[PDB]
Amino acid sequence: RSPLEKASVVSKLFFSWTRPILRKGYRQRLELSDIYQIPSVDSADNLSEKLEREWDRELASKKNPKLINALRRCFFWRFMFYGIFLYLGEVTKAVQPLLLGRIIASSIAIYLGIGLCLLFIVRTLLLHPAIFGLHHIGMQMRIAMFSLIYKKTLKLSSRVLDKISIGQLVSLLSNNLNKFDEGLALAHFVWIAPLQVALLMGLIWELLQASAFCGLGFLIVLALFQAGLGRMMMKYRDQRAGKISERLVITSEMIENIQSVKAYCWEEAMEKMIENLRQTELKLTRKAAYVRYFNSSAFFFSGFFVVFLSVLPYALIKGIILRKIFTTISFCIVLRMAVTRQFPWAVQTWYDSLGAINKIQDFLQKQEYKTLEYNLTTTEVVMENVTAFWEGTPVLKDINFKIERGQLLAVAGSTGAGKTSLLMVIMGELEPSEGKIKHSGRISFCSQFSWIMPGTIKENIIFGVSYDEYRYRSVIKACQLEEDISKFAEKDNIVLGEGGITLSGGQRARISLARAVYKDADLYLLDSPFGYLDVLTEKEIFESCVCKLMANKTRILVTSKMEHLKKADKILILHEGSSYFYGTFSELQNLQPDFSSKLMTTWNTYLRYITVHKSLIFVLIWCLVIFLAEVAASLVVLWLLGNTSSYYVFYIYVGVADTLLAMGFFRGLPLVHTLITVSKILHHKMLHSVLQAPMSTLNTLKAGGILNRFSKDIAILDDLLPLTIFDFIQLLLIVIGAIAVVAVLQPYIFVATVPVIVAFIMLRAYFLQTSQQLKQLESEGRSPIFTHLVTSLKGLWTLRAFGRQPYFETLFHKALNLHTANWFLYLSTLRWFQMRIEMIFVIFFIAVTFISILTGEGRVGIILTLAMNIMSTLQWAVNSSIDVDSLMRSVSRVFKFIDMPTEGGGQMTVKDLTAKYTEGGNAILENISFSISPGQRVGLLGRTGSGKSTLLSAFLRLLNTEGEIQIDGVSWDSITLQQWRKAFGVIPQKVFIFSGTFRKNLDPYEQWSDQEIWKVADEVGLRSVIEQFPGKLDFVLVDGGCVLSHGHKQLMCLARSVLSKAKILLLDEPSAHLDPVTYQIIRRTLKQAFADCTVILCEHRIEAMLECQQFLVIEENKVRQYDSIQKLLNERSL
Amino acid sequence: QESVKEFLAKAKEDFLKKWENPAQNTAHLDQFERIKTLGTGSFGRVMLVKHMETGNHYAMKILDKQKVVKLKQIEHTLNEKRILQAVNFPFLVKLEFSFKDNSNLYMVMEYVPGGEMFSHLRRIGRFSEPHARFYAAQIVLTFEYLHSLDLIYRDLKPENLLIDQQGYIQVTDFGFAKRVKGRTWTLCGTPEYLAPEIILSKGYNKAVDWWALGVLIYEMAAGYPPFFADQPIQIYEKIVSGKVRFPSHFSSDLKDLLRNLLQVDLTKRFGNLKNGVNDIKNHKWFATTDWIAIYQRKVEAPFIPKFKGPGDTSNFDDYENEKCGKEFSEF
């Protein structure tokens, strides 16, 4: 069924499984369905079976939940099998330079060259398969890592479910979403690297026997300094994070109030504040980048001293042949590359794995929900002595409820005041602490909060059932669901998506009632099912099914409606969590009549990135000239020397390509500084552009994309991009310099090197398309798993009620396998790319070696040693090119976002009014006309409730609108929009408040006097409103000014508008937002101070607007005018 | 030391002479007003009155003698009366006169225009850190002065602390206070201020006052009690555990000293080891807290009450045969 199953041994070694996959991908666009079938051994159901069996065996075995000790029994044999070849290949690569310790004598070396060439093939064979094997082991383990906790998700106790952090599990899942899988490559490196040192030290003592630990101590000191720099780097990052979070909060606040900001014309102040805040974060980031650059450069710089100090003692003591010098150079290169890189990375990987193991082992051990032992056989259920806490506080006051088998029970009282908890306990969601509950157990419940998963009508109705024609028809016809179904487009198979927005809340309640009705059980724990429908609809549903069909069976509906409460078989009213009265319907109705009555990646993109800041070009020119001059000087030195012992020692300066071509400390810092400066310039440009964008395109994009436009993208640009770009540049320069040095050795090298580079470029280009397609597909597919997890989290209670968890497990496994298919495909393609690149490099090295062998001792040694080192640099270079390709996506997104178009007396006259949200959308006005009275308010009446916010926005032209607005003789065209809109006074339903002290929050422009501000605030009733604030006026508006009430915020907005001295002021929804006293104070203040303005108070209720003198009646597509109520009340309202 | 210890010695000396000659029945309820009830308080009734003969506004703490007998708190009332009649410290509002009627007893206290700081903290939520230290310094001063007399307050609630026209807090509610040297087995009061030693039902010494003041400072900065639970039994268990999470805004210097103040070890409690209050005085949280200069209370206050005359109740809330006369023989 799977193509990789139909693979030969040689095909498996070549990993050519994706060869037709690559053939299709480089030809045509990616198709998700075209993915090869998942491996049989890769089945989530299969692997999780063994994982769970081992976990259970261990959990029973001993008093220590050592999950690692169990998973060792699952994986250690394969881990050691891969590690054996891994360590063998490491040993081979380490020992290979010693074989070069023979050719230096120059006949016989031809066989040595053939063997050295074969060593590359052998090492590549040993290396390449191991990465794929260990990574397959990792992904296999990770699948069950998800699976065990996912199964436990249906096992947790609800009492801790309300306490367990919802985000903690999400963060736990996301943390190892990619880290733990890739974290296996360094696994056996512990078992190898110490052995690598053991071999290398023996090699050195073989060459020296007297200078061994001299360079080892320098290497250890370098490792110590490198580790020490990390603590300072982490401290700098931690310091930067808080200010970055504050800046993000301010930016999010601006994003939420974008329309109000455009109205207030505060873009400049917002930009100035954002830049001023970002200045300190930029300083911290520059310091952190300097530290990181020093740390990264230390590794490249170490190579010179690493050989120099090791050689200096032996060389001074006695003479040494340069052959051993080159050999020691290679040996030390290997020793350093392992000591400085392998050990710490492996230590970090193991520590992270151990911590994750501890966390996972702790998580699964939590106390689980105990299922009720029921469904055997029973008559009418009864309860006795119900008393327990929902978390002390007895949710039930010794309650008892003997429900007849077939009866229709009901209870009333305060909503969710423990009656819902009593229902949950009866359903088994809450363990009763007192008394004894007995029930048949087969019973459905209907939570007040509907949990609708995606799926068609049949899916929502079945939830693991067959298609019953009569039952489905009865459910539709009885739950008011037949008409709503007919209202659906397909009307039978409308596959619902995510969010449930396709249906109304009463539609969701009807869905819940139908879902409860779908299965027959001992009881139906209804909880206010009619809570979202009209009274007539509720009565119809009751008479049809709720009080007709299932009422013949035992039923318990949480209903407070008096009319149904009269017909109930028994009632149970509880107050303060305690049943005040209950019992038979007639008996309870007669025992207390008084209570009864009372209660009832383009090259153009890279060029634009380069062209952002001119300093980058100068820095690049300086670095390039420095590199070229250094290479030329090295070539001149080599030529002069090749055609007293200090001259021999100077050959070591050429011996290490890393130190010879190292980016000078006097050069690298300017590159990163320019990177940071260009990032800051880009941030400022993006902020300025976002301030001017037209609203029409702004509404088209979702607002959360505006947050994502800077939440991570700017961070990636600041941190990730500079380091990667600099490392790639330095590595490329070093490699190119090595190539030039080798070409200087003999006049044949370039003729072969050029085809190798060209083929490498072609191969990289071919691999890039498939790699990007696979990465995008895999990233896109990951979301559905979190979507299913969130759906399960939302529906947990209803799922526990249904008991059909197997289908949810099937869905989760299907999604996990779907993601795993793409992940394995991408990993395999990357492995094939790595193997092919290694093969190309090996071929080039072999050809160069043969050419040199056919061909002076120092030149041969230099060429061979440079060849002996270039491989790791080339691999890092390929990885860096891939990383740059990955990083360029954020820059492309930023460039696309910046590439946006900009937005572009009291008497007044409007005409030819055309408006819409988008270009050519719903016509908000049909050539509408209106006249503004001098100093008199116009009542926004007529079609109130059909939407007046659009007309209010059109008063400032904040929408896709065009027409005529001739106010005071001034037109809508001559004046700039920033100057034309200022005359209007905004009174939004939601007040926009900048988080900060009152002085800044009320005066963003900062062009007034403090005494005048205090005098106006006293005139605007804010002095007493501010006297209760911290200090006098410096009170920072934390949480968006959470201290201020809605009426206080309205007063603040009115005061700010009065300070702006606007000629107009359109009011909106005064009584809707204001409390009684707040509305009174607002009316008094407006009628006192703002008496001299041509206002427009928009009110849905005509009575609220009845005080207005003028009246502008609204109607669908025609905003009429009614000067006087003598005709307005008789024609517009009547 | 020097002058401060010389003053403490004089205060301790004069307190004994004051305690040995307590007054009784200083006045009758015939020269007061009934303008408004300032509140109830505990199990009594508080009302704002004006001196008919002089004019000075004065509070009157009414309480039923039947309530004292039935609540089994009569000796505590007598001890409170004597201690209030003998107290001498600037940090607290003094008691002026005593009334003893056949129906109830009243106690004359000065008019407190600033009201309770608990309501102000509810209005503002969280005080600034220097604002917290400003009150905490005088609190420590008054507590150590009580240590200079060897008495146990046995009462610490947010509403009991008033504020002066000068901005200094005003102390009241001397009911649970008693001058007992050593350990006492009595247990009562607010669970939020219940030390584990009192919760353990053992002999209690003055050491619990440091924990009470630490809880006061922590809650004043946080706005929420460090120990809180739905039921008092769970609250008692949480207090017995002696563990609570510091707020994100909590400073290291203040929180580290709060760790010593809230240390479950009563012997290791800050202010009880060796030096009395000297270790607290040298603490960096009091790095700028002039203990001696506060004796004049000349420091600029964090906030001043909006006083508009003694007769205004704006700071206050706007609300609305003797039983065993042989026991009340010295009132």
Residue numbers in the entry:
A (entry chain A): 3 to 108, 118 to 402, 437 to 645, 844 to 886, 910 to 1121, 1125 to 1173, 1207 to 1436
B (entry chain K): 13 to 332, 341 to 351
Sentences from the paper on this structure:
An example of a protein activated by PKA is the cystic fibrosis transmembrane conductance regulator (CFTR), an epithelial anion channel crucial for salt–water balance of the lung, intestine, pancreas, and sweat duct. CFTR gating (opening and closure of the pore) is under tight control by its regulatory (R) domain, a mostly unstructured segment containing 10 consensus PKA-C phosphorylation sites. Phosphorylation by PKA releases the R domain from its inhibitory position, permitting ATP-induced dimerization of its nucleotide-binding domains (NBDs) to open the channel. The PKA-C consists of a small N-terminal lobe (N-lobe) and a larger C-terminal lobe (C-lobe) joined by a flexible linker.
Three distinct CFTR/PKA-C complexes were observed including two 1:1 complexes with a PKA-C molecule bound at different locations (termed site I and site II, respectively) and a 1:2 complex with both sites occupied. PKAII docks between the two NBDs, interacting mainly with the helical subdomain of NBD2, and is also within van der Waals contact with an unassigned density protruding from NBD1. This density is connected to residues W401 and P439 in NBD1, and as such likely represents the R insertion (RI) in which the phosphorylation site S422 resides. The main reason that PKAII is less resolved than PKAI is due to the conformational dynamics of their respective binding sites. As the two NBDs approach to form the closed dimer, the structure becomes incompatible with PKAII binding.
